[PDB]
Design a protein around this ligand. Sequence first.
Ligand SMILES: [Fe+3]
Ligand SMILES: [Fe+3]
Lengths: 226, 402, 330, 104, 215, 551
Amino acid sequence: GFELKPPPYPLDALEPHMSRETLDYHWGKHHKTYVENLNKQIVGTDLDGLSLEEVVLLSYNRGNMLPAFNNAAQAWNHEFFWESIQPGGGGKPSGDLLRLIERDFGSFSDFVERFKAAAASNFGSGWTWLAYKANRLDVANAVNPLPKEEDKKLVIVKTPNAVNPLVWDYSPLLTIDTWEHAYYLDFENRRIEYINTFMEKLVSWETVSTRLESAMARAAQREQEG
Amino acid sequence: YSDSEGEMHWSTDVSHAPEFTYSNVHLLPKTSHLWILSGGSCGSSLILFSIHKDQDQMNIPFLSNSDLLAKRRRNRFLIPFQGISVEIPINGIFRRNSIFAFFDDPRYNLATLFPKDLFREKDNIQLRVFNYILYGQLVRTCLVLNWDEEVRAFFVEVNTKGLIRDFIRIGLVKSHISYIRKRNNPPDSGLISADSMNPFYSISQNHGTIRMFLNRNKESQSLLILSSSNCFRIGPFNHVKYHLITIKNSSGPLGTAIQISNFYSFLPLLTYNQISVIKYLQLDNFKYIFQVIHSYLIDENGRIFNLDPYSNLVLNPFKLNWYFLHQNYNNNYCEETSTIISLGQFFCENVCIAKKEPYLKSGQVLIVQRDSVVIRSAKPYLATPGAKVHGHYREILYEGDT
Amino acid sequence: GKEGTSTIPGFNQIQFEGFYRFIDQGLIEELSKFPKIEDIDHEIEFQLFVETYQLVEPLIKERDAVYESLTYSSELYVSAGLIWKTNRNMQEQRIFIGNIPLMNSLGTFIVNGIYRVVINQILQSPGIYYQSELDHNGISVYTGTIISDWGGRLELEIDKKARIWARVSRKQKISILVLSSAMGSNLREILENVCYPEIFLFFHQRCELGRIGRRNINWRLNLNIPQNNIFLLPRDILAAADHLIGMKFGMGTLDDMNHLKNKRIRSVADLLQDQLGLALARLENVVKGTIGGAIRHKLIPTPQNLVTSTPLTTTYESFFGLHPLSQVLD
Amino acid sequence: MQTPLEELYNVKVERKVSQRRLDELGVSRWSVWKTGKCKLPWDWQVDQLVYIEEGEVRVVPEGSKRFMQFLAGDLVRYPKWLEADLFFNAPYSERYCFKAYADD
Amino acid sequence: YYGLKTPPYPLDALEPYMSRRTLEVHWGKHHRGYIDNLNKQLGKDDKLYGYTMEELIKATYNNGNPLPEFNNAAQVYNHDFFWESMQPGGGDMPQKGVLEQIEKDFGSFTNFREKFTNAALTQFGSGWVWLVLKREERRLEVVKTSNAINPLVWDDIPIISLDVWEHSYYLDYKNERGKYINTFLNHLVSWNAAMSRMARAEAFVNLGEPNIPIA
Amino acid sequence: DKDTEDEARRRNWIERGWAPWEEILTPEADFARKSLNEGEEVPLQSPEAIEAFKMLRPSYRKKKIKEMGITEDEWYAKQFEIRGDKPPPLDTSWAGPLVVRQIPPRDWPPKGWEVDRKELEFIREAHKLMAERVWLEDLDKDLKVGEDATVDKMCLERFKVFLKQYNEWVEANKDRLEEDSYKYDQDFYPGRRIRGKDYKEGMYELPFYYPGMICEGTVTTLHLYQGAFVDIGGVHEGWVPIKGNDWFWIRHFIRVGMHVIVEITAKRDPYRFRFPLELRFVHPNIDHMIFNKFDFPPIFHRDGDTNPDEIRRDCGRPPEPRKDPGSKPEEEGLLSDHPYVDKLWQLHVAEQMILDDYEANPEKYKGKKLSELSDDEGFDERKEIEHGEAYYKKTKLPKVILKTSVKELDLEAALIERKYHNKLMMEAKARGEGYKIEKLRRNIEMDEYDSLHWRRSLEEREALLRDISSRQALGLPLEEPGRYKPGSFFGKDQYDPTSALYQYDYWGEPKNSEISKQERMKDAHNKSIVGKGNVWYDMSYDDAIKQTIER
Ligand SMILES: [Fe+3]
Ligand SMILES: [Fe+3]
């Protein structure tokens, strides 16, 4: 039921990089099918378009994998993926992330090499995520009697097919579409170039920071609400 | 009645269809013999079907401010021993809602009974502190333990340099059927109970093959044991009657057969049968279907070598030279040997192979070799027409069974 | 333990072994069956502490007992509990229930100065028995019968594909098509899990099989119910028709009621235990009668005052004097 | 001869692993689990990569009477669905990181 | 230590239903990359080395917990099985035993094609489409397996394999997987290949019926 | 329904493994079957019965044998001839010529037995040659026949190097392997190592063989329940898995003594698997007459096979199934019960036990420092978890005694804490108050040990969740396959007291119920303390500490 949000940048913004005709099918074909299938599957269900993010969580059904889940996750994944890239790209994180990756992944140089290796090692079609970890299990003894600041850290999670860290109660910050359709059309099968160009020419740290300044706001209330 | 454990068998003259279509009873239109193939029945011991399968050799037999001293653990707890007096049954079992401590309060709120551990695991035991009235001291409280399997109480002692302290624990020893997912093993405290597990830090015949088959009328495979008490060897006799830069022919490997791209199979077929040709042949390999074996050997350099392409010639890998095959392996089957005794056939007690050879004991031919034959003991029972055979084919009968 | 393995066993061992079993095991078993005493709820509660039972050697010797025409017997003492909840105070006393007759090593009792022996009785064992039956015209109807420790006669006969009669008595001719739920069981949830169900398309008198019956009902019907359970189960009734149908097709054989495996021998141990149970059954009525009189007069009686030696002594004297099995020693 | 329990239960063992491996694995960032002489029955519902710093741990698979001796400085990867116990006789601490499917 | 086995046809022989350029990367890069990675892993371990292809996949599968070498080991077999499953001038319609078995198990080929296409379409993400023979059930089956999973892990014998990995069709059919699936079954699938795979499978399943004596 | 005498017979062959095997009857037994058909006591009219009657005299047997021209031993051999219709003759047609490459076995070298790695890598290069594409069309091209086709024209160097290594290994292990055969295999059987005088030099060991190679051999023994065994010139005979009534037709073709061309299907460990060389006939082709298949190859059960899981793990057999608990592992509560805390609790008690005694009376303790204190005598013979039996005034209860050596105690840290906590109560006594201490230094170190164990259960659980979806999205099993089979698999009779089938609650619980009898006592026992009291209020124990602290 949800409308397909166009990417917040012109379709011809990264021609010296991944071309528009690739995007004409990655967004105009792949993403259109994902959203329209949801419109054909959420016609009269119990949800009928409550909120897109919780639909993936609701359709997750704790691993039961309802049929609408795959299109729902892909719709959010690609939509989240479009925001992750701006025409400028590259650069380095600005302050807010720097206090984290340095204390979690040693250094930015260590992190980027680790991030590229994780995405490259991702076998088959899937997604690689850099997600803030603010997990809260709905089970006995889940709450830590002595919470610590370093307990909620940044983790690099590689997920197959269509599954996002939202099902782990994590808050994704950035992701790379390691599905072959995202990168196979232009530079053949060189996923390494796809990962390199994504990190050095396409990452939007400011967008990640905006999606990170929200991360420790959903996290900023859990410890004080109780 | 059967005089030995074994499996039912009849060659013929017994109605395959039962008398009624719910019973293991068969009628004989003609008189015939019912054979009981002797076999050890190990039905008195547990059989693990994941490890015990057909034709397995069995070299081994089958099986068969004192508060801070307490502790709240998983479905158990310890308490100091002598105002929290302890009440216990004669043998000691707290079924449900039973009290184990009252703590009579003279003032008529509760004093802590545990060191308030920082992690509250989801235990089945529930502790409740019911306050009674006794009139209608009067508000003497009580300690009630409840679960949702039986608790057991037995005091443990901490010996150290002579001095002694008593400690009563109350476990939740269950039926052991719920002890899945070994994490959930109160046996983590079971060793301090009546257990004798070695810490591997200070601890420092029967034969027979498995004759197991699935009788679908039982939905459970039945087991027989074939050993030296059932199968015996008949004495040796002559029953098999047989009908160039090269070395003598010797039985051995020819080398790995590479796959043929014309047949696009990773492991080459190398052979069709009568059914296969009229079922699997792509109307293009007919030119290659030969009735005679043609052997080709290639080297690491890709060169194709055959020697004479008219006779069965192969290379011996161990001695690295060519030699002839035995009989050219013609497509049409021809009799090479002819054994007097065929495999799987039965005979009675006094059948004679020849004049010199002694008589053959009753049984079924189980193993056929070049000279000797191994027989599985069988006991034929003569049955007249109109008799009723109890049991389906290959059904296990024990001693005394009708 | 290896008594008769090598030598000829003592001729009185059966009498000897039975009595020791009765003293060792047949006393607490019946005493444990003695219930609590209370009317509804008042300043009264009476009970017996079974674990504290004691037996005292008789004062009189065997020669004195026969010469005086007395009964050579031991005295049974059990601690009893009484509380008056209006006072809410516990009164405890070691009461004297009565006298338990003692036999000598030769296997003979003396009651009122006469040597009496308790001969052995042979009865049909509790369990399922499949036996054919013929009628005025001849039906050859296979019949399954269930016997309990009370001599139950729950017959279950098959009239081919028609109903399965379950007459408890001769006038109780009743089917089981609608008795699927019956006592507390259910509808066709497990009835169709064995063979075919197309055929379908009291509290304590004879309802428990006992220790012996559970073994036999499992022995024939091949049931996984543990021997610890005593009460009959609808699974057992369900399995009764299961093997009953097989007899129609020729599988299995009819039980021979004259076979000793179908018989049970009850010795002096069994009979003395039964009379003890009757005595306690008469004893609980005495205390119930006593508390009614005590309440009606409003006096504070000791636990001894609530009991008398009559229920225990009289029943044994009646047993030895009237029961056909208790014969005068020849 | 019977096969050793190591490859029988496909438990990866990397004895006296060189310092190069410990870097890219982030062993310095693995959680610490320290214990003394005790017995820890357990069943691995997920793959676990355990590095041992001191002491030694003897693990017996459930139903077995043979133990697997792991010394200090080794790397042990307990696979999924493994039912066993963790015995100890000396103060023992480990750095571990449970790994999901294709995690790393 | 397995060489990169070339397809039984030149890379340009699949035109126009398959561009040779996509073959140059699907077989020249993806398959060869799988070949090189597997060979490096086999050099480390002498236990995995020495396993046959069918045994190596099943052993590395580890009963549902694949070893790190499984992905490379499974893929090299799948890609090798994929090239032989296709041939120039392929497609058409199977005959003889393969046709009889498909009719016997799936009712009709058109029923099988619908079952085959639906399994291929519903396969989400990277995976393979397998026409396999069940050892215990003694019948043909269509199974969808994601990523490198192949029915050898369940002892099933593959007969026809279809690669629905996005690298196999994107350069020619992009998002039109259905058309790519259809042209595979119409002009690419080698039904002659299935018969030979059936012949080897027949050596282990015996799809025939016995000849019970009258006596 | 029913079953005619054509499908029940078919069902018997397929499911019951029926086969009309020949019965070689004696003249007395043959006469019984031919004469009881006619009745009980009647003149025999059937010529078969009449002839069977005359054969009861072996003298009459001689006349018939003499008349038909038989040496009286062919007749004894004729009676064993297979009766019934013969199967159609086999016509094994080769699928083109067989092309053979002398490829060294992949599994070489054997377990252990380090060899020249440089030579080994040279050998292993031949394995990559398997991928070479070979067509029957380009086969006669550059074909060599005769002198040019001799061995001296062949490279075979990678195979030759393997032979050099193989021969060296054979010499160093010929005696070692033979002794193991005697040590483990009591009796020689087809498929076991040929030992004793029957062993001949030159027999190929198992590492010489590898699946996929073609061998020429002769069948030496036929086993009805196992199959035919082929001698392929090795120490262990090859095995072809032919089982059951399939032999009824195969026995006409596969007969002992014939020469066959066979293909090695699998090679296994001879110690575990009893038939280490699993074979497959390629001439004659029997694949169209083999309907009974071994799901798993038969294995031994050696002396040390105590753990069933080890046995099935050594081979490829599935694990032992168990009843599924029905509870999702991920939704189960986390565990914080660190096992060492229970042991650590014993040490904590001992620290307070010595200190309390030391503080109580200034005994001989002053002679030796607490840290300097040594253990007593006889601590070795204390079994340290030794059981026992005790009995109180009213109750008889089991007792367990736990010794604790003074070596594993931090007395100096404890006594300082003991004194420090002792120097913290007189202030309360200075104000007339209690001094219930929150926790002791031993207690807090239990908290971190539980915290460490809880942390292990935590990060595992979240990693478990991530593992669930990856397997769920990929079809991989969440739990171990084979293990945790569905319900009703374990037989048909399961005692379920919850189910009304096994329920005995017809009209209330009978007074003779052991549960009810063992319920009224708890009714008596719990009311032996309170009597006819009434419960004012009731709540769980966790809440019973909160309001007292809040006071
Ligand atoms: Fe994508
Ligand atoms: Fe592919």
